[PDB]
Design a protein around this nucleic acid. Sequence first.
DNA 1: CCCTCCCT
Lengths: 72, 71
Amino acid sequence: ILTIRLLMHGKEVGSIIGKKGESVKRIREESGARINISEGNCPERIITLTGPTNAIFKAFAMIIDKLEEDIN
Amino acid sequence: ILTIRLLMHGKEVGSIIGKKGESVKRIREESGARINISEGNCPERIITLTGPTNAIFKAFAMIIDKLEEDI
DNA sequence: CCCTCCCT
C-alpha cells in the first residue's frame, strides 16, 4: 500500500476528469487505486495515487495513456 | 410539526452528508429538525424534513448553502 | 472536460 503524488497543469487535469467525471470514474473503478485530485482552479494540481503496486501501475498507465492521446 | 419531502440528485445529497457524516450532523443539530435521507446509491433521493416552520426553514437554508457553494 | 462526500 503506497502513495505517489503527480503534479499537473490545469488543462492536464481536465483530461483525467473527462466531461462529467467519467475519465477518473474508469481509472478509479478499473485500477483499484485511491485517486484524489485537489480541486480549485489552481494552475498546479496534485493527483495522489494510493494503494498496492499494481493498482498504482494500472492507474498510472491509464493516466499516461489519457495524456498520451492529447498532443496537442 | 410539518413534513416536507425534497427530491435530490445523488451528487447533491452526498454534499449534504459531506465527509464522514458531519455535514448532516451540523444541520440536524443547528436547525433542530427531523431530517431523514433515503439510502443506497439510487440516483434519486428523498430528504424528509419534519418540525416547525422555523426548523424546516433553518434546515432548508442550511442545505441551500451547502449546495450554493458548488459552484 | 471538475470527479467522489454515506448520515437517522
